[PDB]
């Protein structure tokens, strides 16, 4: 069956993408501190292939870490739109998830998923660096289940 | 008291002058920096082997919420609404009515885990040790709707983590 | 029983270093130049 | 429509519009606007998808928490259709392709699938149903696309007499294959046109108007069992319309006449693509097929929607196609195209 | 000579995992080929060191 | 059999460039108390393969404000010239035995600068332009000094031929007679190859990504490959100039072993330095060479024209 061969090309491209995730240098609030601690020696995200890059065009994942305000909302969407596809978004913490401690404020977007599509939600205020690393390792499992080439074949 | 940090005058004798000149020309002070990094190359890193190795925690950790039961199996929560009245983020929603046997119990008990600030006040305000924060910190979801916990989800957590919640409360209740 | 609390040892904790400590290293200025110039002369020869 | 299907709120994201909608083909060009409007007013939208879940992420910000629901469906599977429509008060069908893949012909996608969707909807007691046909659809066409569109328009009426068939003309928008198609011909130097486009007339309609027309059908009980022809306000000769496209994009326009028979041979060449073919023999037929004039069918105006002029909303599509030299050009810089008066 | 002991502790890791096939199973699954004192096991097949 | 030789040169070079990314990440990792890549394949050996595939199946995008023709030429011009610097390198036999090989490498190095100027200019972004003009400034700093340092060394080799540097050093390394020039040559290669503390054109902390902020997917990969091919190539150049290996015609393999080891250590020093120092400021990088290196380089150039004459040590012309 020819469907087998594409099912083995999907594994290759899926492996290359989850093995080489490149987050954008994008933090907003206290949660971004715990994102530094995931780069610190104890957890060393770089040993999973995760490498921060400043340029949006050289990034694969946006990690929304902190509160999103109405003044900052247009800026977040722009840098997301400037990420080449395939692109993924991780929502870290409670401010980025559903407004957190400031849900009822006037200058805060209630949830970063109103502005961008989100893949993984990481709960906590802040989520421990180990909790975030669980989120990233869960995002890799979601990329390992993609069947782009097995869906194109059956079209 | 106080102390000056950058108030010095170099010695101008010839030997001290030549030491500074030799340092400038031969980059001696730039090579101590290379020594410091070289020592770290031959040290052992502080990295752990996640997820096969976990970072240490303590009995006081504040992770995922749960609702507990008595050893009989009756629910601890008696719908007093103190956890709701103290939640800084207004993340808890509660309704109650007299049960079939006339017990003060809840019909609704929701926690919005995307509004919670994981502050622990709810378990401080509970007079019967019903609402606690388990030690679980690995419950990342894939949809925003999965983080809105209802009484069924929270009661399930208690029955899932009870073996460990009781051990942590036993090892910590004397400080509370 | 008596009161048990997180307290220090009876004699207190030992000393704790806190001042800067950057040891002096290396040969003086004159010696470093002699070896520098000395190597050239051999290299030229 | 019991107590749980009564509207509440003021028609916002968090309001309850009392609409439960199943949208088939919601990941297409027209799908993302129907879903956008339904979620804006607070509607429980079910979105059965065939593609990878990643290809539906853009639809997630369009609805409140728990409002947009995704299901894995198959066109040829009768059970998956029922699992997705059994709770809907309206089913909107948007399934379609511009080419025949190795697994689906125009009869598969415009006859067999729409009929199956309509059949199961009636078996599930769905109150409303909407089918998107084509304006130029007719049995005696030279294009399998429009011929199959004519059979489907007839099967749906038989299966679901109370359906609201809609017959849009060519739709233009940001992600269209109508204005982006012509603008992309520049890659090949000239702009071949059968008869040089002097004997073809088009009456394109704007994407948002079709959407606002669809939503008005759902809420308007008078549209039940009727057929509509959504169309723009002005008719343009194909030559004058394509000349306008290259005018707005500020690209050199070099039209040359290419015979109809030779054009098909080129259309045969591009079809060898195992991916989205750039052009197809069938697409050439549709491009040069004069838009009908159906003065008996109701149109947009009967649904309260004002047709949007192509000139007003053409710059937003084509500004992407200009070079840096001309990005900052304004809307007024190009005189409008010549129209065919009634 | 300590330096020879380093090699021996390296080889005792091959024999500590039950052979070469066991050595490679833990190298690839866990990216760590150390040997620990089995504390115990649970009902799901997890081993604790 | 010549086309086979070219493939036997460029293909290994790309592989070395790919795994230099792993080495840098794993070396900087341990100097930083981390472990670097160790999850993707045993000890990370598959990490470069994952990155290379990820880049080339990503979406490249040409900005709306770009200049198309130049925007695509720059990465092609970058990588092509990076592989061109290798053809005349004696190891111990060069692919192309150029009589004026030292001049040829000087000229190609200058030409390779315009792949930075045109990429930053064609991007049509302000951070891309700021980085482009930090390369104009950076070249104005080292180009004159670097040329004169080579001249000073060649006054003891006798000719511009690269293979003659081997003959010159058959009795002793050139680092001994010329250690002051090696010190200034090593810093010049740091600045020329745009490396920390002299990696100013890219300047992540100040210009996000510098001249290549708008480049993604494969086009970005070509810049990344070109940059590391220069890092290896210049340290191979340094080993030949100052640490010349001995050549045995009957066992040319032994040369390639000693030659490769010296080029590795010189390459590890580049990673070692990048993990030890802050970044210069691009105006200070200019005053470092014009006011410290240039005065001393001119003096040593005179000293190396007179030293052979006053000692009767002029080398043969051929
Ligand atoms: C010889 C040329 C003789 C004179 C040519 C006509 C003069 C018009 C003068 C008008 C004027 O003042 O401005 C120039 C005129 C208009 O300038 P503008 O509107 O002010 O600014 C936009 C520019 O046009 C530029 O806009 P653009 O970038 O979108 O143009 C695209 C394309 C030039 O656009 C084209 O016209 C190319 C297509 C023409 C050939 C195809 C003709 C159709 C034949 C059938 C097609 C079969 C397809 C088979 C596949 O430019 C190129 O890069 C191709 C040049 C390749 C050189 C290598 O630009 C031109 O396109 C004229 C030159 C086009 C022919 C290229 C000749 C290269 C020289 C060798
Ligand atoms: C024994 C022999 C040994 C020989 C050894 C020496 C070898 C030669 C040394 C190397 C020579 C380098 C050549 C110069 C680089 C090009 C210069 C340039 O950038 O002008 C762009 C210039 C501007 O066009 P543009 O950049 O597209 O406009 C900007 C818009 O944003 C454009 O935006 P857009 O919307 O149009 O972008 C879309 C477009 C963009 O497509 C592209 O990205 C172009 C890709 C071409 C990459 C070429 C580099 C590889 O995609 C397409 O649709 C492609 C079809 C459209 C035609 C593409 C136009 C090609 C231009 C000519 C190349 O093109 C012209 O005006 C053509 C005029 C003629 C140019 C040459 C005149 C200078 C002569 C110097 C060379 C001496 C002649 C002999 C050379 C051949 C000897 C073998
Ligand atoms: C250094 C390395 C440099 C060389 C590069 C080596 C790369 C080796 C891996 C090859 C992987 C090829 C598949 C990559 C396809 C990219 C992709 O995922 O697109 C999905 C696309 C999209 O699928 P689709 O057609 O169903 O989606 C279209 C509609 N959308 C996007 C809206 C959903 O699928 C393909 O078309 C890929 C077809 C598979 C065959 C690819 C071979 C092309 C011909 C060259 C041979
Ligand atoms: C791996 C295998 C082993 C490799 C060898 C070990 C790497 C050596 C680098 C680390 C050195 C450790 C620091 C040290 O000892 O020096 C600091 C010491 C301390 O420097 P200082 O500035 O504190 O004081 C010394 C000088 N006075 C007192 C006058 C100010 O500096 C030195 O003595 C180094 C001098 C060497 C200068 C050589 C530069 C020219 C090189 C020419 C090309 C060769
Ligand atoms: C964009 C990329 C453009 C190509 C990059 C290369 C630029 C030209 C390099 C010049 C080659 C050279 O001079 O080598 C010297 C070297 C110097 O060698 P030599 O001086 O030692 O002499 C060799 C032979 N002996 C010693 C026996 C006398 O030339 C050669 O080695 C062989 C010369 C053969 C003749 C080749 C002529 C054609 C090459 C000219 C191409 C010019 C294109 C310029 C395009 C620039 C556009 C940016
Ligand atoms: C802090 C960063 C700046 C310092 C960077 C310095 C890095 C470069 C250090 C090079 C050390 C010399 C290479 C030692 C390892 C390889 C030795 C080798 O293969 O050849 C044997 C070399 C000598 O072999 P040889 O081939 O070079 O011959 C010696 C020189 N002639 C040709 C004149 C006879 O011996 C050693 O280097 C051992 C010390
Ligand atoms: C890359 C370059 C790395 C250089 C590393 C050289 C080693 C430096 C070193 O040895 O310093 C440490 C050592 C400390 O010993 P100590 O003197 O007892 O310290 C307390 C004194 N109160 O201090 C020493 O003993 C110094 C011993 C090394 C001194 C080298 C001689 C001076 C160098 C200047 C000339 C350099 C050029 C010579 C030609 C080079 C040719 C290869
Ligand atoms: C016994 C051996 C004795 C050796 C000779 C001892 C005398 C050397 C005097 C050299 C110093 C000259 C005077 C001086 O110190 O000027 C310093 C001045 C400082 O400039 P700066 O630090 O940049 O900022 C301004 C701070 N006031 O700098 C200046 O403003 C002017 C700097 C002048 C630069 C001269 C550049 C020449 C470099 C090439 C050297 C070879 C010269 C040719 C040899 C001629 C003899 C044959
Ligand atoms: N110029 C125009 O756009 C015109 C539009 N129409 C009609 O509107 C309808 C949709 O509009 P449009 O956006 O242009 O079409 P698109 O090509 O943009 O999208 C087609 C949609 O239908 C789905 N689809 C196609 N085949 C199948 C299949 N076998 N199984 C499941 N889903 C399928 C696709 O799902 P997926 O891709 O995710 O697999 C996709 O969501 C079509 O019927 C079209 O004929 C009528 C007049 C003019
Ligand atoms: C410049 C030269 C290239 C130009 C572009 C053309 C190449 C397109 C690649 C797909 C070809 C194709 O269609 O391959 C089809 C074959 C087998 O399909 P089948 O069972 O025989 O028929 C089914 C046809 N479907 C799929 C349209 C329904 O699938 C493969 O295993 C090919 C995938 C791997 C290709 C290498 C990467
Ligand atoms: S979620 Fe918590 S840690 Fe993150 S920004 Fe909000 S309050 Fe700070
Ligand atoms: S931990 Fe704090 S914020 Fe969270 S539910 Fe309890 S009281 Fe509310
Ligand atoms: S404080 Fe405790 S007993 Fe009172 S409502 Fe909350 S969980 Fe129930």
UniProtKB/Swiss-Prot annotation, chain A:
Catalytic activity, reaction form: a ubiquinone + NADH + 5 H(+)(in) = a ubiquinol + NAD(+) + 4 H(+)(out)
GO-annotated biological processes: aerobic respiration; electron transport coupled proton transport; mitochondrial electron transport, NADH to ubiquinone; mitochondrial respiratory chain complex I assembly
Binding positions ([4Fe-4S] cluster): 30-31, 95, 125
Cofactor note text: Binds 1 [4Fe-4S] cluster.
Sites of Hydroxyarginine modification: 53
The enzyme's E.C. designation: 7.1.1.2
Keywords of the record: 4Fe-4S, Electron transport, Hydroxylation, Iron, Iron-sulfur, Membrane, Metal-binding, Mitochondrion, Mitochondrion inner membrane, NAD, Oxidoreductase, Respiratory chain, Transit peptide, Translocase, Transport, Ubiquinone
GO annotations of cellular component type: mitochondrial inner membrane; respiratory chain complex I
Membrane-topology descriptor: Peripheral membrane protein
Superkingdom, taxonomy of origin: Eukaryota
Modifications the protein undergoes after translation, according to the UniProt entry: Hydroxylated ar Arg-53 by NDUFAF5 early in the pathway of assembly of complex I, before the formation of the juncture between peripheral and membrane arms.
Oligomeric and partner information: Core subunit of respiratory chain NADH dehydrogenase (Complex I) which is composed of 45 different subunits. This is a component of the iron-sulfur (IP) fragment of the enzyme.
Protein name: NADH dehydrogenase [ubiquinone] iron-sulfur protein 7, mitochondrial
Originating gene: NDUFS7
Curated annotation (Swiss-Prot), chain B:
Compartment annotation: Mitochondrion inner membrane
Residues binding [4Fe-4S] cluster 2, per UniProt: 87, 116, 119, 122
Domain 4Fe-4S ferredoxin-type per the UniProt entry, residue ranges: 68-97, 107-136
Presence of the UniProt keyword Metal-binding in the record: yes
Principal location: mitochondrion
Cofactor binding, per record: Binds 2 [4Fe-4S] clusters per subunit.
Biological process according to GO: mitochondrial electron transport, NADH to ubiquinone; mitochondrial respiratory chain complex I assembly
GO terms of molecular function: 4 iron, 4 sulfur cluster binding; metal ion binding; NADH dehydrogenase (ubiquinone) activity
Domain of life: Eukaryota
Name of the protein in question: NADH dehydrogenase [ubiquinone] iron-sulfur protein 8, mitochondrial
Organism: Bos taurus
Native organism taxonomy: Eukaryota, Metazoa, Chordata, Craniata, Vertebrata
Interval of the full protein contained in this chain: 37 to 212 of 212
From Swiss-Prot, chain C:
Cellular component, GO annotation: cytoplasm; mitochondrial inner membrane; mitochondrion; nucleoplasm; respiratory chain complex I
One BP term from GO: apoptotic process
Transmembrane segments: 27-45
Subcellular location: Mitochondrion inner membrane; Nucleus
Keywords on record: Acetylation, Apoptosis, Electron transport, Membrane, Mitochondrion, Mitochondrion inner membrane, Nucleus, Respiratory chain, Transmembrane, Transmembrane helix, Transport
Source species, domain of life: Eukaryota
Keyword NADP: no
GO molecular function: NADH dehydrogenase (ubiquinone) activity
Subunit structure: Complex I is composed of 45 different subunits. Interacts with CARD15, but not with CARD4. Interacts with STAT3, but not with STAT1, STAT2 and STAT5A. Interacts with OLFM4.
Function of the molecule: Accessory subunit of the mitochondrial membrane respiratory chain NADH dehydrogenase (Complex I), that is believed not to be involved in catalysis. Complex I functions in the transfer of electrons from NADH to the respiratory chain. The immediate electron acceptor for the enzyme is believed to be ubiquinone. Involved in the interferon/all-trans-retinoic acid (IFN/RA) induced cell death. This apoptotic activity is inhibited by interaction with viral IRF1. Prevents the transactivation of STAT3 target genes.
Similarity section: Belongs to the complex I NDUFA13 subunit family.
Name of the protein: NADH dehydrogenase [ubiquinone] 1 alpha subcomplex subunit 13
Organism whose genome encodes this protein: Bos taurus
UniProtKB/Swiss-Prot annotation, chain E:
Disulphide bridges: none
Subcellular localization(s) per the UniProt record: Mitochondrion inner membrane
Entry-annotated residues carrying N-acetylmethionine: 1
Signal peptide stretch: none
Function: Accessory subunit of the mitochondrial membrane respiratory chain NADH dehydrogenase (Complex I), that is believed not to be involved in catalysis. Complex I functions in the transfer of electrons from NADH to the respiratory chain. The immediate electron acceptor for the enzyme is believed to be ubiquinone.
Subunit structure and binding partners: Complex I is composed of 45 different subunits.
Family: Belongs to the complex I NDUFA12 subunit family.
Protein name: NADH dehydrogenase [ubiquinone] 1 alpha subcomplex subunit 12
């Amino acid at each position: 069956r020819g469907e087998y061969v594409v099912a083995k090309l999907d594994d290759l491209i899926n492996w290359a993408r989850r093995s080489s995730l490149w987050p954008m240098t994008f933090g907003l609030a206290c949660c971004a501190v715990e994102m530094m601690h995931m780069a610190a020696p104890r957890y060393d995200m770089d040993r999973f292939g995760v490498v921060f890059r400043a340029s949006p065009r050289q990034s694969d994942v946006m990690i929304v870490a902190g509160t999103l305000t109405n003044k900052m909302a247009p800026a977040l969407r722009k840098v997301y739109d400037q990420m080449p596809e395939p692109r993924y978004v991780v929502s870290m913490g409670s401010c980025a998830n559903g407004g957190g401690y400031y849900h009822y404020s006037y200058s805060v977007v209630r949830g970063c998923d109103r502005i961008v599509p989100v893949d993984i939600y990481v709960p906590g205020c802040p989520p421990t660096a180990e909790a975030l690393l669980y989120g990233i390792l869960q995002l890799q499992k979601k990329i390992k289940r993609e069947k782009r080439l097995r869906i194109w074949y059956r079209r | 008291t106080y102390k000056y940090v950058n108030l010095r005058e170099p010695s101008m004798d010839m030997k001290s002058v030549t030491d500074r000149a030799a340092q400038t020309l031969l980059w001696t002070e730039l090579i101590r920096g290379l020594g410091m990094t070289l020592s770290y190359l031959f040290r052992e890193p502080a990295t752990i082997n996640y997820p096969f190795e976990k970072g240490p925690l303590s009995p006081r950790f504040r992770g995922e919420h749960a609702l507990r039961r008595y050893p009989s199996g009756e629910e601890r929560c008696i719908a007093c609404k103190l956890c709701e009245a103290v939640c800084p983020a207004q993340a808890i929603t509660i309704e109650a009515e007299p049960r079939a046997d006339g017990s003060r119990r809840t019909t609704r008990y929701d926690i919005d885990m995307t509004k919670c600030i994981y502050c622990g006040f709810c378990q401080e305000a509970c007079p019967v040790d019903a609402i606690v924060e388990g030690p679980n910190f690995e419950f990342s979801t894939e949809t925003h709707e999965e983080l809105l916990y209802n009484k069924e989800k929270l009661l399930n957590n208690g029955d899932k983590w009870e073996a460990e919640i009781a051990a942590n409360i036993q090892a910590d209740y004397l400080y509370r | 029983s008596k009161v048990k609390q997180d307290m220090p040892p009876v004699g207190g904790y030992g000393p704790i270093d806190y001042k800067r400590n950057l040891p002096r290293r290396g040969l003086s200025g004159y010696s470093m130049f002699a070896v520098g110039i000395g190597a050239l002369l051999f290299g030229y020869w | 429509l019991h107590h749980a299907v009564i509207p509440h709120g003021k028609g916002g994201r968090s309001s309850v519009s009392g609409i439960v909608a199943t949208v088939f083909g919601a990941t297409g060009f027209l799908g993302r606007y129907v879903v956008n409007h339904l979620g804006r007013m607070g509607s429980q939208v079910i979105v059965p998808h065939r593609c990878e879940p990643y290809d539906t992420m853009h639809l997630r910000p369009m609805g409140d928490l728990g409002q947009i629901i995704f299901m894995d469906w198959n066109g040829r599977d009768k059970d998956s259709i029922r699992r997705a429509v059994e709770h809907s008060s309206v089913v909107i069908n948007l399934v379609g392709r511009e080419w025949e893949t190795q697994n689906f012909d125009f009869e598969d996608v415009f006859v067999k699938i729409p009929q199956a969707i309509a059949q199961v909807s009636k078996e599930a007691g769905v109150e409303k149903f909407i089918h998107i046909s084509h304006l130029n659809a007719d049995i005696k066409s030279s294009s399998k696309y429009l011929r199959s569109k004519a059979v489907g328009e007839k099967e749906v009426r038989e299966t679901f007499p109370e359906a609201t068939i809609i017959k849009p003309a060519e739709i233009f928008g940001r992600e269209d294959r109508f204005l982006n198609y012509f603008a992309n011909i520049r890659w090949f130097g000239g702009v071949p046109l059968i008869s040089l486009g002097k004997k073809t007339v088009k009456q394109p309609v704007y994407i948002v108007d079709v959407t606002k027309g669809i939503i008005n059908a759902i809420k308007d009980p008078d549209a039940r069992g009727k057929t509509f022809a959504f169309v723009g306000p002005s008719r343009y000769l194909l030559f004058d319309l394509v000349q306008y496209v290259f005018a707005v994009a500020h690209r050199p326009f070099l039209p040359y006449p290419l015979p109809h028979f030779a054009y098909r041979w080129i259309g045969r060449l591009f079809e060898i693509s195992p991916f989205e073919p750039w052009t197809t023999r069938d697409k050439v037929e549709r491009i040069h097929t004069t838009d009908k004039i159906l003065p008996h069918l109701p149109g947009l105006e009967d649904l309260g929607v004002e047709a949007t002029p192509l000139e007003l909303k053409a710059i937003e599509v084509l500004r992407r196609h200009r070079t840096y030299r001309w990005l900052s050009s304004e809307i007024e810089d190009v005189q409008p195209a010549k129209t065919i008066p009634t | 000579m300590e330096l020879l002991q380093v090699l021996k502790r390296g080889l005792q890791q091959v024999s500590g995992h039950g052979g070469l096939r066991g050595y490679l199973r833990v190298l690839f699954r866990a990216n760590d080929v150390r040997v620990g004192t089995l504390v115990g096991e649970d009902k799901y097949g997890n081993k604790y060191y | 059999m010549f086309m086979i030789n070219i493939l036997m040169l460029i293909i290994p070079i790309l592989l070395a460039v790919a795994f230099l990314t792993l080495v840098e990440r794993k070396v900087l990792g341990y100097m930083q108390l981390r472990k670097g890549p160790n999850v993707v394949g045993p000890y990370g050996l598959l990490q470069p393969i994952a990155d290379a595939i990820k880049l080339f199946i990503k979406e490249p995008l040409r900005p709306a404000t770009s200049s198309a023709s130049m925007f695509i030429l720059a990465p092609i011009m970058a990588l092509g010239l990076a592989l061109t610097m290798w053809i005349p390198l004696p190891m111990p036999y060069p692919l192309i035995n150029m009589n004026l090989g030292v001049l040829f490498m000087l000229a190609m190095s200058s030409l390779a600068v315009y792949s930075i100027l045109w990429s930053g200019w064609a991007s049509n972004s302000k951070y891309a332009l700021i980085g482009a003009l930090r390369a104009v400034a950076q070249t104005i700093s080292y180009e004159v000094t670097l040329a004169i340092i080579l001249l000073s060394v060649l006054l003891m080799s006798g000719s511009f031929t690269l293979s003659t540097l081997i003959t010159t050093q058959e009795q002793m390394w050139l680092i001994l007679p010329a250690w002051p020039l090696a010190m200034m040559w090593f810093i010049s290669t740091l600045a020329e190859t745009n490396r920390a503390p002299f990696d100013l054109t890219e300047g992540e902390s100040e210009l996000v990504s510098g001249f290549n902020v708008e480049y993604a997917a494969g086009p970005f990969a070509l810049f990344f490959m070109a940059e590391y091919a220069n890092i290896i190539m210049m340290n191979i150049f340094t080993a030949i100039l100052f640490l010349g290996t001995s050549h045995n015609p009957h066992m040319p393999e032994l040369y390639t072993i000693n030659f490769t080891i010296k080029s590795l250590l010189l390459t590890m020093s580049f990673l070692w330095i990048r993990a030890s120092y802050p970044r210069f400021r691009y105006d200070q990088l200019m005053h470092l060479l014009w006011k410290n290196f240039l005065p001393l380089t001119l003096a040593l150039c005179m000293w190396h024209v007179s030293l052979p004459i006053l000692t009767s040590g002029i080398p043969p012309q051929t």
